[PDB]
Design a binder for this molecule. Sequence first.
Ligand code: SAH
Lengths: 265, 265
Amino acid sequence: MVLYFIGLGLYDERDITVKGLEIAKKCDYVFAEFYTSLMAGTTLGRIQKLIGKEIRVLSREDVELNFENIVLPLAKENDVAFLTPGDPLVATTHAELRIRAKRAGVESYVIHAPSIYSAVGITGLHIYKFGKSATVAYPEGNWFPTSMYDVIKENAERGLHTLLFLDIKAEKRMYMTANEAMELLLKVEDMKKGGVFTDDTLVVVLARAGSLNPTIRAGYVKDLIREDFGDPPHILIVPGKLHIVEAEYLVEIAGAPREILRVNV
Amino acid sequence: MVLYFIGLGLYDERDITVKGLEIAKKCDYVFAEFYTSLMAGTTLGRIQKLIGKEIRVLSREDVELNFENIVLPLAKENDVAFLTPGDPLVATTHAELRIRAKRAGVESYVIHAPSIYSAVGITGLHIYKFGKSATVAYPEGNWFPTSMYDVIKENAERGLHTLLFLDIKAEKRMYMTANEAMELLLKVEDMKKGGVFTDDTLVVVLARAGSLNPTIRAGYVKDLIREDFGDPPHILIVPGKLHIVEAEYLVEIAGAPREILRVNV
Ligand SMILES: Nc1ncnc2c1ncn2[C@@H]1O[C@H](CSCC[C@H](N)C(=O)O)[C@@H](O)[C@H]1O
């Protein structure tokens, strides 16, 4: 009698780990949420098919307000599993749910899955060189988010790369593009003129990580802010000072201007 | 005419994604490497039975010096797979291999899998608050590494968490423990007296991630320095200032002492 946190992966249903599939296949009740990220290459049907169980989907409100009412209860008598895109505990507040589980007298286990946070390694940028991370959020009301700007500034000053999580509103089916983010940033630039994010800043975009053919592009903002990378989800990265080997991967694989090959030491 | 970089996961032969397995089976040749890391929770033999293909294990020199002489040739006329622990491209040196694949006129695809870099999310610490990452390499002869120490310093300075990869001797099959890593850090503290890592520093240890029974513990060095965290591999983490939720998780789940609720928050 337990509760399982299983990640479904980056793109399609096949991105679940074997461990995760075997275990999902033996649980009595299987819940899931699809609001923390977007798996562009699959459908609830295929997941349900692959697993072999009916998956009751939950909304942000069900999860955040009644997890212990809807899911935890069954967990005491049965073997329940909660599915989520990517890795269940990366860039979500699901970790807290484990405390609910404990306090509800329920044993919980975690089955990891490929996360966008580590998939960025496909851009050639050294993983250890990524600093703090941030999320470009949808502007709303009379307030224009600005934190993500300072973060890029802080990391850049230290020579670190910045991972920018783009926003999502599942219910409204809104998936921020790298373009919608490059614009939101250029605006924060003018508001602060910090030299952080301009038209000559180098940027890398990763779209549909997990698919066989993700869109990996690196270039100056001016030349990319008006490009079609493809369907979502999109991720934006503002690199710091590149290593020669990083620059070479970006040029040879990501299609960046040959000029970055010449790094400023 | 195609090369696949498939990730093997975190601990056992089941940490591979259904994607990576289905593909690995459809390959004419399968290579692997276990020098960047080690699947402590399985064996090459158990892995070979899951894939149902034999696997030629490549040494470090093999890959870094003659990848284009051992792997790429067969990739021209067949579909070849290259297995590596964790998620590919998280080992900085693997990325450049894709360039070589192109140079030799070969298609290369990447099949991600759970990485320790993202799995750390299970510690209850927020992913975005992780800063630059470092590695605690085994000292040798007159050599006494110290960069890691500074990496911690710069991160916690900015309220960021520090993920410390512990060293490994693949061949000799020798895992560095969290305890050992702590002793090394305390030794650098005494050498630089920066206040960065002391008997009162709070740390989190994560052992055997990916397993259903990983060890997750959090406390002050003076109590974890000699604590037994179980079989390898080990990962050490020096957290920055904690959000009340991280602290609660570290207490409710990682058995951290209540003191952290009022000291490290
Ligand atoms: N497959 C993918 N490709 C590119 N970006 C992705 C992605 N999956 C998620 N993202 C990015 O991350 C955001 C969701 S945050 C949730 C991440 C998920 N928990 C994980 O472990 O991967 C998306 O809005 C997008 O900005």
